[PDB]
Structures are given as C-alpha cells and as structure tokens.
Amino acid sequence: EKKLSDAQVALVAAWRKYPDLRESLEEAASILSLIVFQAETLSDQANELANYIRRQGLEEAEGACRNIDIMRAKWVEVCGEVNQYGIRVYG
Amino acid sequence: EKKLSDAQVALVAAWRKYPDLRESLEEAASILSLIVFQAETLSDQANELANYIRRQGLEEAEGACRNIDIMRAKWVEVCGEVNQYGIRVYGDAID
C-alpha cells in the first residue's frame, strides 16, 4: 500500500525539519522524479509496441503483451498516473 | 552526472545523522527500491518484445525496437545494471 507520494512527503518533511539535508535530499527527490519519468516513457513505448503486435495477430507474443498490461496496472498502484492537467493522481 | 546510488546513499546518510528520520526515510528507500525493481522488470519485458520483433524480421516496427534500446541505455546511465551476482554496477564496471 506504499506510494510514490509517500516517498515524496518523507523527503521534503525531512529537510524542512533539518535544513542541512536540503541539498542531498532535494537531489534524491530529483533523481526519483527522473527515474519515474524515464520508466513511464519506456512503459508507454512498450505498451504501444504490444498494441502493434496484437493488431498484427502475432499470438506467439501474447504472453509478453499480457505481461506488459499486468505490469502497467501494478505501476499505477504505486506511482499513479498523470492526467491532462499535469496532476499525478492515485486510486 | 548523478546516479541512483547518490539517492540511495543520501537517504541512509540522513537517518544515520538524524535517527528520528529512520522510519520515514527507510520507507522512502523501500519505495524507491520497489519503483526501480518494477521499472527494470518492465524494461526487460520490453527488451524481449523487441527481440521477438527482430527475430521475426518485422521491419515495420524496427523504429520501436531502436527506441527501446535508446531508453534502456539511458536508464543504465542513471541506474547502472544488476549483474549475475545481484550487484548493481555502473559505467565501465558493467559487463
């Protein structure tokens, strides 16, 4: 039941309490954001490749395509999703 | 520039200095770790999709395979690569 937002809360809470931690934990926060962004870029790319494969009727890769769907749903549980207003929302 | 290990080390450094942060920041560290694990699991699946495409000779989607290679390379720049002994290694220490 752990979420991306939980980690983000903890990081800012930490250096607001202890300002000497600002430089290192804002950096960690930026690295976490970078990681999430890169992951979601590759995930979308994988999803679109999987969609293409399905449309081509290539049943040999059907297990793989199904795995991409399962993994994408699991990701949204932890990291939510960004809507059209640029807000990251959770279930 | 700055790597996954930098973030990892920063979390630990912080609660070693301020023990009262250990609960919140250990949790954060485990979330970071989970996110990296799920990303890398999906990445490996994406890589095998591309492998399948290329084995079939399906050139229509070759651009997607090149895209996946580029993104995996960029990921490894930041997050390194876990070797067969489960050690995450970076840069020229890979392969």
Side-chain angles (χ1 to χ4, degrees):
Chain A
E1 72 309 325
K2 52 207 325 219
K3 286 175 176 173
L4 171 56
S5 54
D6 289 320
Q8 293 171 325
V9 168
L11 286 179
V12 188
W15 63 254
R16 286 195 160 138
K17 185 175 185 180
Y18 301 109
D20 60 307
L21 303 174
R22 200 184 211 263
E23 194 186 314
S24 66
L25 295 187
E26 286 233 66
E27 185 170 89
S30 64
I31 291 166
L32 169 65
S33 187
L34 196 81
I35 282 171
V36 162
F37 178 85
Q38 290 197 20
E40 291 185 335
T41 301
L42 177 52
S43 177
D44 290 350
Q45 171 67 79
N47 192 48
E48 289 299 330
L49 180 51
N51 289 339
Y52 171 75
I53 287 166
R54 281 171 172 132
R55 292 192 293 269
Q56 295 295 111
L58 302 164
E59 292 177 350
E60 185 183 338
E62 168 51 357
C65 294
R66 192 186 326 274
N67 202 17
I68 291 301
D69 283 343
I70 289 164
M71 285 179 299
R72 279 172 57 82
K74 197 170 177 179
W75 178 266
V76 168
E77 295 182 15
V78 177
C79 293
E81 56 186 17
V82 186
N83 60 21
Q84 71 170 44
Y85 301 97
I87 287 84
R88 182 167 296 275
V89 303
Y90 298 85
Chain B
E1 28 202 289
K2 221 65 151 176
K3 315 292 189 54
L4 172 62
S5 58
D6 293 313
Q8 293 173 341
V9 160
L11 299 167
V12 169
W15 51 252
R16 279 174 177 179
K17 186 175 193 179
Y18 301 108
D20 48 314
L21 296 176
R22 193 159 198 274
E23 176 174 319
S24 68
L25 293 191
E26 270 189 319
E27 185 172 306
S30 74
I31 294 171
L32 173 62
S33 170
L34 174 60
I35 289 173
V36 167
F37 180 87
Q38 287 190 26
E40 290 185 333
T41 302
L42 182 147
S43 180
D44 291 340
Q45 183 64 87
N47 183 51
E48 300 307 337
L49 271 198
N51 280 342
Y52 168 81
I53 289 292
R54 282 162 164 165
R55 294 287 182 174
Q56 299 302 112
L58 261 155
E59 261 297 306
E60 196 159 273
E62 171 58 16
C65 302
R66 284 196 314 266
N67 289 353
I68 287 167
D69 285 337
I70 292 171
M71 289 175 204
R72 279 170 62 77
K74 183 140 82 173
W75 178 269
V76 172
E77 288 185 60
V78 181
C79 291
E81 198 154 48
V82 183
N83 64 23
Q84 54 171 324
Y85 293 113
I87 308 298
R88 180 171 302 275
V89 295
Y90 294 84
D92 289 311
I94 298 175
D95 299 344

